[PDB]
Design an enzyme around this catalytic site. Structure first.
Site, short mmCIF file in Angstrom:
data_model
loop_
_atom_site.label_atom_id
_atom_site.label_comp_id
_atom_site.label_asym_id
_atom_site.label_seq_id
_atom_site.Cartn_x
_atom_site.Cartn_y
_atom_site.Cartn_z
N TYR A 62 24.01 -43.33 88.15
CA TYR A 62 24.02 -41.84 88.13
C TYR A 62 23.36 -41.39 89.40
O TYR A 62 22.18 -41.67 89.61
CB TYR A 62 23.25 -41.23 86.94
CG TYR A 62 24.16 -40.40 86.11
CD1 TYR A 62 24.74 -39.25 86.63
CD2 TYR A 62 24.56 -40.84 84.83
CE1 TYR A 62 25.66 -38.52 85.89
CE2 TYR A 62 25.51 -40.14 84.09
CZ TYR A 62 26.08 -38.99 84.63
OH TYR A 62 27.04 -38.30 83.90
N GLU B 43 23.65 -37.98 90.90
CA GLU B 43 23.79 -36.54 91.14
C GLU B 43 22.97 -36.09 92.35
O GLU B 43 21.84 -36.54 92.55
CB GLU B 43 23.27 -35.75 89.96
CG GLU B 43 24.11 -35.87 88.70
CD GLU B 43 23.38 -35.34 87.52
OE1 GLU B 43 22.22 -35.76 87.25
OE2 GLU B 43 23.93 -34.44 86.85
N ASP C 225 45.50 -28.11 102.88
CA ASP C 225 45.55 -29.23 101.97
C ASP C 225 46.48 -30.26 102.57
O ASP C 225 47.71 -30.12 102.52
CB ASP C 225 46.04 -28.77 100.59
CG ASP C 225 46.11 -29.90 99.57
OD1 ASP C 225 45.92 -31.09 99.89
OD2 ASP C 225 46.37 -29.53 98.38
N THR D 104 43.60 -35.77 99.20
CA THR D 104 43.44 -36.96 98.41
C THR D 104 43.04 -38.14 99.30
O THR D 104 43.35 -38.17 100.50
CB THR D 104 44.77 -37.32 97.71
OG1 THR D 104 45.83 -37.38 98.67
CG2 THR D 104 45.11 -36.30 96.66
N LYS E 138 47.60 -41.64 98.44
CA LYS E 138 48.82 -41.17 99.16
C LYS E 138 48.84 -41.82 100.56
O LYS E 138 48.57 -42.99 100.68
CB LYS E 138 49.00 -39.65 99.13
CG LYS E 138 48.86 -39.03 97.75
CD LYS E 138 49.26 -37.56 97.68
CE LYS E 138 49.04 -37.08 96.25
NZ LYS E 138 49.38 -35.68 95.93
N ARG F 162 42.12 -43.55 94.35
CA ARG F 162 42.47 -42.25 93.84
C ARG F 162 41.20 -41.38 93.78
O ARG F 162 40.21 -41.75 93.14
CB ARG F 162 43.17 -42.45 92.47
CG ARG F 162 44.17 -41.42 91.98
CD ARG F 162 45.09 -42.09 90.96
NE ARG F 162 46.25 -42.83 91.49
CZ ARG F 162 47.38 -42.23 91.88
NH1 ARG F 162 47.43 -40.91 91.79
NH2 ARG F 162 48.41 -42.92 92.39
C1 LIG Z 1 48.83 -34.95 94.97
C2 LIG Z 1 48.33 -33.70 95.58
C3 LIG Z 1 47.16 -32.94 95.07
C4 LIG Z 1 46.41 -33.34 93.82
O1 LIG Z 1 45.72 -34.57 93.89
P1 LIG Z 1 45.26 -35.23 92.49
O2 LIG Z 1 44.34 -36.32 92.98
O3 LIG Z 1 46.52 -35.73 91.81
O4 LIG Z 1 44.54 -34.20 91.66
C5 LIG Z 1 46.78 -31.80 95.72
N1 LIG Z 1 47.42 -31.31 96.80
C6 LIG Z 1 48.50 -31.90 97.35
C7 LIG Z 1 49.14 -31.28 98.55
C8 LIG Z 1 49.03 -33.14 96.75
O5 LIG Z 1 50.13 -33.76 97.23
C1 LIG Z 2 26.12 -36.32 81.78
C2 LIG Z 2 26.72 -35.18 80.98
C3 LIG Z 2 27.91 -34.35 81.33
C4 LIG Z 2 28.71 -34.48 82.61
O1 LIG Z 2 29.34 -35.73 82.80
P1 LIG Z 2 29.82 -36.08 84.30
O2 LIG Z 2 30.78 -37.25 84.02
O3 LIG Z 2 28.51 -36.44 84.98
O4 LIG Z 2 30.60 -34.91 84.89
C5 LIG Z 2 28.36 -33.35 80.46
N1 LIG Z 2 27.70 -33.08 79.33
C6 LIG Z 2 26.60 -33.76 78.93
C7 LIG Z 2 25.87 -33.43 77.66
C8 LIG Z 2 26.06 -34.84 79.74
O5 LIG Z 2 24.95 -35.49 79.32
#
Ligand SMILES: *Cc1c(COP(=O)(O)O)cnc(C)c1O
Ligand SMILES: *Cc1c(COP(=O)(O)O)cnc(C)c1O
Lengths: 415, 416
Positions: free
Chosen positions: B57, B59, B202, B228, B231, B237
């Protein structure tokens, strides 16, 4: 570049290799008591190290945008089916990228910006995602919070009054630093009485709930969100569980609402973690988590500390440090020097500033995963108290560090 | 035991998931992937995201974390940041976004409020879901004005400028998921500056090409550039935000504590690995091949009587207008799939067909190039595609093409 013999982290990126090796060693060499932390299995890690990262699979099983999803459909449906089985849920979505995205999926499905929500006070153990003004949950919505009573349990009567006053569209329950069983049935009654949805964020407790050792919110809530990591001991990611009547809005909110391609390798890892969680061995593990937390709390009380709420009924506790005249910040630092990892946390009516605090939060999931039992939980409690009583004494810190080293050598994380 | 690496294997713990993964590995080998958003990432990238960094963790940001014990994950994240800044010449970066979608959402959360007006490229003309679709966050909670193509099927910059002056958007989005040409980012930046709007580019589809210097870089011109890491960039990813330094504080705050929690440090390690790979001379050679192979594939299809939207490609991608062969995008996708060539249907400008039918397919070269195809193979692939398009229901044709595809996939394995 694509020969598995040559494309190793060490060969391609020696710097990243080195950092990973040092992190592996750090995980072995410290006792982790951060209550949100755990160690996931080699099988779970192997799944998220798989070629499933290469597949774009927007949509849902049997209802994908692109072809070639026959095998990732098997993976996602196993994850869905297993998580439904674990929690008795009517429906599930296993695509959320994180706990945060699971919560945002519910909000996007059910609310509009400016709507009023209720959540547990951050100062009293609620999470950032339950309405903080610097989190989406609080910046774009109108938040009313409820907290603890004088006995440091949830003030259900006060929550009920707030719900009737403010008429929230949705009530969030759950917590990241609250040791007791939450009365989900009671919170559902309150929500129903004002026509609000009830969302329970069970991230901290989900593993306990799966094992039947903490109450299950699923029968009572419209929506239950969780991380797949933390006490569930899975990969990092999220899940939404929902009543069947909300299946369509929830699925639409995750995609195309707030996500794109799901992380199919992570979803495979979720499926593996869910299979693990269905096992009798996982139930035994969680029984040990609960026992170890109780023993740790008992030991700290014997050494003159105080537990917020007076007891734990879970994996977690908040320790009021005032009797030892040490701040949470100072405790965290000194314990860290002795190779015990904790985090500072405010207590109810904390006299110290927010980055200082009068408390530390401790949890048992991680130490339990590496094999600690009640004798070790007690030792750890005593080592903590030893540090708290003389936090700047080099000899004390060194003595504790040496004892920690004996424990970590006897109880390796990974073999 | 459950934490002994000898015993905790996918095969032992979860035979069903193991079997599905093995089948997916085989599927990846046995089809020619022409979906323009797909690629194959390296064993080293996969190994990083299979690491114990999933247990941490972390953060906050490097040297500014909520919890202790982040010395080594700080090294990882800072390497990712430094390398991606180096790749693109960016003033600042955030490598925590969980996805491309979260990268975009981070910019919106930092800079906008619900109800604000934004401009984006029309989805019908090659824009992405995240550039203002009414069922995506981008369009449901914001007021979206879209710009598209002119009669020549290039971006209508004059029209975009008139729309910007009319609607006064707070933020203009540029970038596309199905547009073959170089986008004039300098011009879009002039338009945005002229109305006091932020420019967000983007670059997800083009990012690998941009890193290699074979497609124009938006970074000198944009306030924010999102992408991303998968791609064309060929990473794990996930997402990245690149930003001018004056926006570093709001962007970082928007990602955490704004819209995310703990970053995926194992995936960030994988990003850092991918970025090191992208900095190499071999990656530039790869992207030169991606561009050459897309051009050859397009040229071959034109020889066979098809039409390319925009009249040419200048990138990794093309949209094929299928009308001359009297076949729909849906029908083409299905027939090609039967022949082990993976494509996706896509609407063309002023498509006469319904949205789930379409008159086009989108094709891209990144994946086939990764597995080692060169111009001879790009040409063969073009001819195999045309063969199917000309006789899509003919069993003998489909079988002959499938056999040829099998020869190619055996010759050019993805992983060894
Ligand atoms: C694929 C794509 C996204 C979204 O990415 P994810 O990782 O699938 O959420 C955003 N913008 C463009 C232009 C894309 O081709
Ligand atoms: C840690 C936690 C989250 C957020 O999870 P992430 O995967 O860190 O985004 C949400 N709610 C509760 C209660 C948590 O303890």
């Amino acid at each position: 570049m694509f020969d598995r013999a040559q494309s190793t982290i060490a060969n391609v990126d020696p710097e990243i290799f080195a950092a990973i090796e040092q992190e592996n060693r750090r995980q072995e060499d410290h006792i982790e008591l951060i209550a949100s932390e755990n160690y996931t299995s080699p099988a779970v890690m192997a799944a998220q190290g798989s070629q499933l990262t290469n597949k774009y699979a927007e949509g849902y099983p049997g209802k994908r945008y692109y072809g070639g999803c026959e095998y990732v459909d098997v993976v996602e449906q196993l994850a869905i089916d297993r998580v439904k089985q674990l929690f008795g849920a009517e429906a599930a979505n296993v695509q959320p990228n994180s706990g945060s995205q699971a919560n945002q999926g519910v909000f996007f499905a059910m609310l509009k910006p400016g709507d009023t929500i209720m959540g547990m006070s951050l100062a009293h153990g609620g999470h950032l995602t339950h309405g903080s003004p610097v989190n989406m949950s609080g910046k774009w919505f109108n938040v009313v919070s409820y907290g603890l009573n004088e006995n440091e349990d949830i003030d259900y009567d006060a929550a009920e009054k707030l719900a009737n006053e403010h008429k929230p569209k949705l009530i969030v329950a759950g917590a990241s630093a609250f040791a007791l069983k939450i009365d989900f049935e009671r919170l559902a009654k309150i929500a129903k009485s004002v026509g609000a949805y009830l969302m329970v964020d069970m991230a901290h407790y989900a593993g306990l709930i799966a094992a039947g050792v903490y109450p299950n919110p699923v029968p009572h809530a419209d929506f239950v969100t969780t991380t797949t990591h933390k006490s569930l001991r899975g990969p990092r990611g999220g899940v939404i569980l929902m009543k069947a009547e909300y299946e369509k809005p929830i699925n639409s909110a995750i995609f195309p609402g707030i996500q794109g391609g799901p992380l199919m390798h992570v979803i495979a890892a979720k499926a593996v973690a869910f299979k693990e969680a269905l096992s009798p061995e996982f139930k035994e593990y969680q029984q040990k988590v609960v026992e170890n937390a109780r023993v740790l709390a008992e030991t700290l009380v014997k050494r003159g500390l105080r537990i917020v709420s007076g007891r734990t009924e879970s994996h977690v506790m908040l320790v009021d440090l005032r009797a030892k005249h040490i701040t949470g910040k100072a405790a965290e630092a000194a314990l860290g020097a002795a190779h015990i990892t904790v985090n500072k946390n405010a207590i109810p009516n904390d006299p110290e500033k927010p980055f200082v605090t009068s408390g530390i939060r401790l949890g048992s999931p991680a130490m339990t995963t590496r094999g600690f039992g009640p004798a070790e939980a007690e030792q750890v409690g005593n080592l903590i108290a030893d540090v708290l009583e003389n936090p700047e004494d080099a000899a004390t810190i060194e003595r504790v560090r040496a004892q920690v080293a004996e424990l970590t050598k006897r109880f390796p994380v990974y073999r």
